[PDB]
Every structure is written in structure tokens, then in C-alpha cells.
Design a protein around this ligand. Structure first.
Ligand code: FJ5
Length: 208
């Protein structure tokens, strides 16, 4: 059973802007996703300070970057707190309506797309490079779910029957045909070094 939902209008508008605006500095998507993973990792770590059993679903806190040139996907995996079904539906655990409004207002005033993270909606920068994004997630005591959208105003949510994750979130970027540079080891390394040097969890770049 797959449920299909409409994005709030403001979010659909932001996604369209991201997809259709000319902007060459697309590499910022990766910093935003790694930042999100870091925040989710902070949260499970904090909760584990008073309830160690929350780590029964996995003690290692890290981020993996997995390029697949055959499938044309870049996958970012973390072992953070994970999202519930409600989190996914409610704009991936974010106050995206108010964030997206302010961001589009700032862009009107002369801000640039790279500042998206300041408005709490950095996730949507994924659409700079991806034609479709799948988010697979698992929170303690809830089921594993898959969220997916190719923009166009809607997203789906379903119970995921793929490889079980202990706990955390996997973001699978199905890259646009002209954005395969983000599957190359040296390019990814460059971006991580430039934008994510002070992330406090191990980031492992898989090779093929
Ligand atoms: C799909 C995006 C949004 C995403 C979410 C999570 C995640 N898993 O559990 C979570 N649940 C959370 O509560 C974690 C934040 C602690 C999150 C999460 C949700 C929203 C944000 C965006 N923030 C939200 C607030 O404003 C700044 C950006 C970051 C991570 C993640 O680990 C990686 C990601 O790329």
C-alpha cells in the first residue's frame, strides 16, 4: 500500500525554484545532507545519555557515502535517531512551510541558494542534483518507512520492505543525467573537505 500526498503549496514552489533556477554551485546539497545526518546523530547520542538502551538498535554513530555509477545514485546513510511516519509526512521532521517562505523571501531580497540551510530547509537542495529522492528511515519502536518524491507536487510514503536498517536514515539521490560528477571519488572528497571538515562523526566514502 502506497500513500500519495500533496506538498504544501509553499514547499512545491520552493522545489520548483530549486529545479528551475540557474545556479551553478550545486555541490552545496551534500553539506546540507551531511549536516542533517549530524543533527540526527546528535539527537540519538543525547537521548542515549539517559537511556543507553536506545542504542540497542546500533551503537556506532557514523555517516556513509555510497556512490553507485551503475544505478546513477548517491546514497547518504546515517545511524541517527531516525524518523517516524508522522515525521516523514510532516515535511521530514521540519517546519518547512515557514522556513520555505522566509527563504524564498530572502532570495527576493538578494540572498543566494547556498544560504538555504539557514532557513532549516536544506534538504530540498537535493533537487539541485537529483531527479528523484528516496528517504528510507527507521526510528526506535516504529517501523521502517520509505518516503519518495520526483517533485511535481507530490510525495509517497510506504512501509519499506527492503534491507532492514537498525536505526537511522538513508537518503538515495537518483542523479540527473548531467550531474554524475557527484559519483566520482575525488569530487566527493573535495566537497566533504571543503564544506564538512568539522562534522563530529566519521564519514566513510565507499569506493566501487
Ligand atoms: C531527509 C532529511 C531531512 C534528513 C533527515 C534525517 C533525520 N532523521 O531523523 C531526524 N529527526 C530529527 O529530529 C533530527 C533533527 C534532530 C532527522 C532530521 C529531520 C530534519 C532535519 C532538518 N533540520 C531540522 C530543524 O531545522 C534545521 C534542520 C534534520 C534531521 C537525517 O538523519 C538525514 C536527512 O538528510
Amino acid at each position: 500500500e502506497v500513500e500519495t500526498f500533496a506538498f504544501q503549496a509553499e514547499i512545491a514552489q520552493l522545489m520548483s525554484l530549486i529545479i528551475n533556477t540557474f545556479y551553478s554551485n550545486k555541490e552545496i546539497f551534500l553539506r546540507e545532507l551531511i549536516s542533517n545526518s549530524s543533527d540526527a546523530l546528535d539527537k540519538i547520542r543525547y537521548e542515549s545519555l539517559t537511556d543507553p538502551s536506545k542504542l540497542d538498535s546500533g551503537k556506532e554513530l557514523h555517516i556513509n557515502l555510497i556512490p553507485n555509477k551503475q544505478d546513477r545514485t548517491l546514497t547518504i546513510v546515517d545511524t541517527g535517531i531516525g524518523m517516524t511516519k508522522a515525521d516523514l509526512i510532516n515535511n521530514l521532521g521540519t517546519i518547512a512551510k515557514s522556513g520555505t517562505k522566509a527563504f524564498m523571501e530572502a532570495l527576493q531580497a538578494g540572498a543566494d541558494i547556498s544560504m538555504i540551510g539557514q532557513f532549516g530547509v536544506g534538504f530540498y537542495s537535493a533537487y539541485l542534483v537529483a531527479e528523484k529522492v528516496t528517504v528510507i528511515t527507521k526510528h526506535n519502536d516504529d517501523e521502517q518507512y520509505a518516503w519518495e518524491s520526483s517533485a511535481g507536487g507530490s510525495f509517497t510514503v510506504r512501509t519499506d520492505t527492503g534491507e532492514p536498517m537498525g536505526r537511522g536514515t538513508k537518503v538515495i539521490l537518483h542523479l540527473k543525467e548531467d550531474q554524475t560528477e557527484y559519483l566520482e571519488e575525488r569530487r566527493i572528497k573535495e566537497i566533504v573537505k571543503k564544506h564538512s571538515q568539522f562534522i563530529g562523526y566519521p564519514i566513510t566514502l565507499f569506493v566501487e
